[PDB]
Structures are given as structure tokens and as C-alpha cells.
Design a protein around this nucleic acid. Sequence first.
RNA 1: GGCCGCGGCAGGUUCGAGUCCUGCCGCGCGCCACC
Length: 443
Amino acid sequence: MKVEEILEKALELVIPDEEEVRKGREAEEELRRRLDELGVEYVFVGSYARNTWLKGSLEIDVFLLFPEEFSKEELRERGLEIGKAVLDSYEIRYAEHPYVHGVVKGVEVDVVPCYKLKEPKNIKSAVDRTPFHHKWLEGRIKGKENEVRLLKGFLKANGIYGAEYKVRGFSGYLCELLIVFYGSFLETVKNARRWTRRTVIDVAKGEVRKGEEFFVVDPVDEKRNVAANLSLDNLARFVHLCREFMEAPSLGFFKPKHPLEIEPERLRKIVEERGTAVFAVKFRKPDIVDDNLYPQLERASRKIFEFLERENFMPLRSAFKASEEFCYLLFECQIKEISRVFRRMGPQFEDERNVKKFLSRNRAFRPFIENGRWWAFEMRKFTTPEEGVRSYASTHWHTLGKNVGESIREYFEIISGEKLFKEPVTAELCEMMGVKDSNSSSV
RNA sequence: GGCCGCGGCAGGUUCGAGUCCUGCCGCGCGCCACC
Ligand SMILES: Nc1ncnc2c1ncn2[C@@H]1O[C@H](COP(=O)(O)CP(=O)(O)OP(=O)(O)O)[C@@H](O)[C@H]1O
Ligand SMILES: [Mg+2]
């Protein structure tokens, strides 16, 4: 359990076994075979072309390079055409930039179209940097392949690996750049401890400077932030892990933790013990790609959260879950119930024109003077968070994100109490409430 | 699809809204995710 003895045992988890590598090379051999027959200009990129892919996470990426003059429509129609021709079984589901996800001799293959650029300054597609990424990295990353795998494994084990909106973490390319800049996994951990939200890491200049935000400058484009989608919270979650790790190294930092089945009874006691209002918004999952869904669940969850605050229900945290058929928006509030009366502010006693208008309004109770101005008692239209959210989600469905809001329009329901705990949201609830010992890394 | 802006224009809430909530339109090949 010394710092180096643990990195040894951890390499056994992040390094692909030779049986998997062989499967990769065989699929690569057949992939090159089919591509050459089509006479298309291509290149192998990604974690496979640099031998930095994690054990069990084998995926081959193949870029097809087309002329610059090609329309975005022409890039798509030709890219997919080649893709489908090369893959055994394929599947086309993307958010913006078209590509073909499929299989070849049993390995994951992605056939991505892009523009054959010279100098990637003002890229035309979103992925035009990826070939230049590989050209820059192949010569510098050599020998350090396992140092990347330790970092990728360290992050993946703590659920902050991936730049996708489902994660808002560290892209696989960002990890490689960090190894080139620090030299080893251990040197990234040591230094990361003293990162701040202002940290700038310009790899191309071998410099660390201060800035407006966290910013890892892309060697290929000095305007591009490689860590653009890394949330501030996930940045923090990473820094915290590094301080903990150096303070007390362990193999558990590389073991993937998984949720535990919590009894609906134990959960009922925890919420009762807290005396909070725990409820969820349930609706049909819109049939869209994850990268459109999660930004919208974030928005919807926030709009309702903000609503609960200004309505004085004092919300603690928000959360959401996406099962296969349904989406859930969870909320916890300190106020299970509020009074119906509240005090609305009136005008100062001086200017009677406004006061006369104010006191003319028919109210159930008599208004009063306080510290020099008039006040009135008025009634709330709802007295619980559940009743409030029912109203907001009903009327303001449209502001909760395009697809989520339209799905909430057609149907939603507020689930509370024991009926909630029987829903696929236990894991999310335990995280939200800070429930202890609802996780394990047992194999 | 989400996000950040420069503008706006109306509508709602209110004694009172450039200031809180909402809708619509313009313009930055604006940024990010899908590799
Ligand atoms: N969000 C992002 N930011 C910067 N570059 C990205 C990126 N997503 C993809 N890329 C580029 O596309 C290449 C491969 O992308 P992916 O296959 O999706 C992850 P990877 O690099 O293969 O690591 P991984 O297989 O361990 O997940 C990367 O080398 C990178 O150059
Ligand atoms: Mg890959």
C-alpha cells in the first residue's frame, strides 16, 4: 500500500489483456482491408491509434477525409455511404455531426466523415481537429501509454470521465494532454491539487498561467478550450480526489463504485428523519439522443428549482433520472407546507394617490402601517411544493426545454412518499440527500 | 438541442417595473455536446 505498489495493482485494471488487443488488431486489419478496396482517403485516430484505450473499452475510430469544397450535405451523404459499406452491422444516431456507429468482427467502430484541412484554424466541421490531434500526439505520447490509462481509469472509476453532457467531465484527449504536460499520472495528481477555477494550462507553450476560467489550451488551436465542458463542480470533485489520494493512497480509487438496493422502508425513515418534502416530476422520455436530453433535464430541473425558491418553499437540492421509458425530476424542500396568508408591500403614507389605489382593492383582511409604509395581507394560491409544481409544470411547460416541455405538456404527474421509492430513482435520491453507505465497489 | 451575449418589442405580477415571471423577432459561419 505504498504510492507505487498501488499504481502497480491498478495497472492490472486499466491495461487491456492480450486477448482483447488481438481482437482489436484483427478488426483493424479487416477494417483497412475494406477501406482500401473503396479507394477512400482515411486515417486511424483516437485512443486506439495511440494505444491508450482502457481495458474493456475497445473502440476503433476511423476518419474519412473529404475535400474542403464539399457541402455539409455532401459530406454527410458520402460519409454515411462509405460507413455502411465497411461495417458489418451499423447504426446511425447522432446529434449534429453525422457519423456511423457499428461493428466489425465484433469490435466497436466509428466511421466519422470530416474535411481534409491544411492547418486547422477555422475548422468547417466540429471534428476537423481530431486528425491534427493524432498527428500532434503520436510522437509525444510514446512510452506514456499506461500513464494515460491510469488517469482515464482513475476518472472513469469516479464517474467524471467523458466530456459528454451526461458527464461534463474529462475528455479522453484532455487526459492525454495532461500526461504530456506533467509526464506521469502521479505528476498530474500532485499538481492538480493546487489547480483553481482560474487555472490555464497551455500545453503548446509548456506554461501554466492564470485566466478568466479553467482553460486547457489546445495545441492544435489556441482558441479552443479542451476542457470547455468540464463543469466547475466536476473540476472540484477531481481536485478533491487528488488531495485525498496523495494523503492516503488506495486501490479503491480505481474500483468502480455501484449503487446498492436500498429498502423502501429505510428510505422512508431517512426522509421522515429529515422532515423534508421529497417529490418527483414523472413524464414520458422524449425519443432523442442523450446529448439533447440531458441539457434539457438540467434546464427543466433548474426552472422548477428556481420557482420553488421564489415561492419560499426553501429547496435543498435538485436531481433527475432517465430510465428507458420515463424521465424523473426530483426535488427536496425544507417547507412541506406554508401558510396561505403573506404580506404584500404597499406605498408610503405620503403620496395618497397611490395609497388610495392600494387600499381600494377588496381584501379579506384589513391592511396596516409599518415603519412608514402600508402593507396588506393576501392569500397564496397553493400551500405545498407539490401543489406549486403541479401549477408551474402545467402552465409553464414550454420553458422547460423544447422536447422535455412538450412531453411534460402531453402528460406528467407528481410522485411523492412511498410511491416514489418504488420508482427507479433510489440511487439518485441517496446521492441527493447525502445518504451514507448506499454504494459499494465489491466484485 | 443546451449555453453566453448585444439589442429589442409586447404580455403577465404590482400602488409602482429598464429591475421579478413569460412569449416572439433580429444579429454574433458566437460557445459546447454527439468523434
Ligand atoms: N470533446 C472532445 N474534445 C476534444 N477532442 C475530442 C472530443 N471528442 C472527441 N475528440 C477527438 O476525437 C478523438 C477520439 O474521440 P473518442 O473516440 O470519442 C474518445 P478517445 O480519444 O478514443 O478515448 P477513449 O476511447 O478512451 O474514450 C480524440 O482523440 C479527440 O482528438
Ligand atoms: Mg475510441
